[PDB]
Amino acid sequence: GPHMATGQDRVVALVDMDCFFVQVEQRQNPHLRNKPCAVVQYKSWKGGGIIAVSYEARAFGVTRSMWADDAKKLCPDLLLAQVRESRGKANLTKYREASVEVMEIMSRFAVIERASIDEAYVDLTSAVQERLQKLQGQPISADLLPSTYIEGLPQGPTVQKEGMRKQGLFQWLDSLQIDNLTSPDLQLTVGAVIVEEMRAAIERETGFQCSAGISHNKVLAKLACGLNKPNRQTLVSHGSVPQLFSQMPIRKIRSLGGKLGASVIEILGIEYMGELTQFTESQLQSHFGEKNGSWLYAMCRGIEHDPVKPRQLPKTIGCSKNFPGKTALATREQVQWWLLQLAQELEERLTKDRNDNDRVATQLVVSIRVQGDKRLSSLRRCCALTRYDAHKMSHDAFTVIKNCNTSGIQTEWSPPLTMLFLCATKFSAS
DNA sequence: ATAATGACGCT
DNA sequence: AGCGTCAT
Ligand SMILES: Cc1cn([C@H]2C[C@H](O)[C@@H](COP(=O)(O)NP(=O)(O)OP(=O)(O)O)O2)c(=O)[nH]c1=O
Ligand SMILES: [Mg+2]
Numbered sequence: 400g401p402h403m404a405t406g407q408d409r410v411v412a413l414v415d416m417d418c419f420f421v422q423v424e425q426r427q428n429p430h431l432r433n434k435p436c437a438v439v440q441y442k443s444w445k446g447g448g449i450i451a452v453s454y455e456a457r458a459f460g461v462t463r464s465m466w467a468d469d470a471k472k473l474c475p476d477l478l479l480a481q482v483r484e485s486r487g488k489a490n491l492t493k494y495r496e497a498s499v500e501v502m503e504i505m506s507r508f509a510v511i512e513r514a515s516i517d518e519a520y521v522d523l524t525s526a527v528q529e530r531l532q533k534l535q536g537q538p539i540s541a542d543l544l545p546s547t548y549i550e551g552l553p554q555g556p557t558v559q560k561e562g563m564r565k566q567g568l569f570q571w572l573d574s575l576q577i578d579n580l581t582s583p584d585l586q587l588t589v590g591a592v593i594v595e596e597m598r599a600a601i602e603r604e605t606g607f608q609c610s611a612g613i614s615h616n617k618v619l620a621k622l623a624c625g626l627n628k629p630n631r632q633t634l635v636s637h638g639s640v641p642q643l644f645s646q647m648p649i650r651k652i653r654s655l656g657g658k659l660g661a662s663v664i665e666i667l668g669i670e671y672m673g674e675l676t677q678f679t680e681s682q683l684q685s686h687f688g689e690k691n692g693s694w695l696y697a698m699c700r701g702i703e704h705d706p707v708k709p710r711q712l713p714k715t716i717g718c719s720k721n722f723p724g725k726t727a728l729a730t731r732e733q734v735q736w737w738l739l740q741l742a743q744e745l746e747e748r749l750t751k752d753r754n755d756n757d758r759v760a761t762q763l764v765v766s767i768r769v770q771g772d773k774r775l776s777s778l779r780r781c782c783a784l785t786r787y788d789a790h791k792m793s794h795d796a797f798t799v800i801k802n803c804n805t806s807g808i809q810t811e812w813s814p815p816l817t818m819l820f821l822c823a824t825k826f827s828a829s
Numbered sequence: 830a831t832a833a834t835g836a837c838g839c840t
Numbered sequence: 841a842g843c844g845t846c847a848t
């Protein structure tokens with residue numbers, strides 16, 4: 400009983416920017432603020448693919464992956480901003496630079512793990528200990544958690560949203576043990592007070608709003624973070640897991656959203672995270688392998704161990720472009736030209752990277768897709784990266800792939816190429 | 830005819 | 841090393 404390791408040793412947060420690219424455009428262009436807007440890339444085919452949607456536009460049914468002309472059918476006052484284009488391709492530099500803004504602020508409170516362009520995990524265990532010594536042993540106010548939700552509360556014996564939020568918050572605080580510094584519920588509560596402050600600083604200093612989740616691990620933090628977007632944070636406690644998971648679709652836990660989670664549903668014949676507790680670990684390892692079974696056995700009990708790695712900077716810098724339909728690259732003049740375009744954006748980013756973060760890449764990864772191939776990558780070969788020069792890299796990339804050209808003649812390329820990819824990896828201090 | 834990325838796992 | 845999974 401006492402000998403069951405309950406996974407409450409750490410405080411972990413996930414901070415995720417709300418409709419990030421839309422917010423980045425709305426700061427630049429006031430005209431777009433507090434209106435239905437989407438961010439699109441490439442206007443030509445159907446008015447553009449949408450990649451980010453404001454919450455106002457979401458309310459009409461606009462989703463990412465949508466064509467902008469379909470979007471205008473559900474939402475005719477939709478406003479659009481389009482991604483920058485350079486050298487024939489979408490260029491995400493604005494949002495990368497806006498991301499650095501936000502990660503840098505986050506870094507002041509705690510070590511962060513950049514998880515994507517718009518979210519980072521936080522390990523607040525140490526900071527919580529400090530704020531807990533500072534706090535003598537005094538109660539925690541609800542004024543210190545003005546945007547926090549407590550998952551599972553309220554329960555027991557106001558019908559409008561903000562009032563409901565405070566009721567759960569006061570229920571949570573009315574049952575706190577504020578004299579016990581190793582009480583994991585107190586620890587979470589304190590973590591969420593820091594995340595209120597970290598989130599105020601972000602919006603104070605950037606104009607960007609975010610949501611967040613505060614729990615004991617990365618899966619729960621991520622999952623908590625999406626229960627009350629936008630502009631809100633959510634505390635998932637160890638004790639709230641069994642109710643939460645009893646109706647939680649398996650596909651919603653991170654890394655179960657694909658073929659693994661579909662096979663858990665299909666082999667086990669279940670639907671919800673909580674039905675995994677029935678199985679023994681050995682059982683789950685026979686169905687799903689040694690690491691997954693172990694991982695699943697703890698995860699359904701709300702235990703996960705993957706640590707917040709100290710890594711604020713990407714490990715790979717890549718540029719890619721699809722050539723869909725009858726835009727597939729069929730001449731070798733054509734393949735060279737786009738390999739050079741890509742290599743010029745890669746060169747400029749690598750030079751900025753070196754001056755920014757004092758490191759040089761040593762390996763260039765080339766990848767193409769051919770037309771009619773059913774995989775998303777047909778080939779991927781490495782080669783040495785010794786100079787940050789676009790023509791050398793694109794020359795090197797071409798020779799690494801030139802023998803994929805099966806066309807009978809010299810100047811053609813067959814079958815036509817549907818994707819090109821250049822990535823810099825293997826960084827070393829400079 | 831989503832598209833542009835970026836991390837991590839398997840052999 | 842090259843490929844595959846899952847994510848955002
Ligand atoms: C999911 C996803 C997002 N993005 C770009 C713009 C998104 O704003 C940036 C951050 O992703 P996110 O947090 O999953 N989506 P969001 O920030 O727009 O919306 P939310 O407020 O977090 O729900 O993702 C893509 O470019 N491809 C994607 O598949
Ligand atoms: Mg976001």
Ligand SMILES: [Mg+2]
Nearest residue numbers: 415515517518
């Ligand atoms: Mg995100």
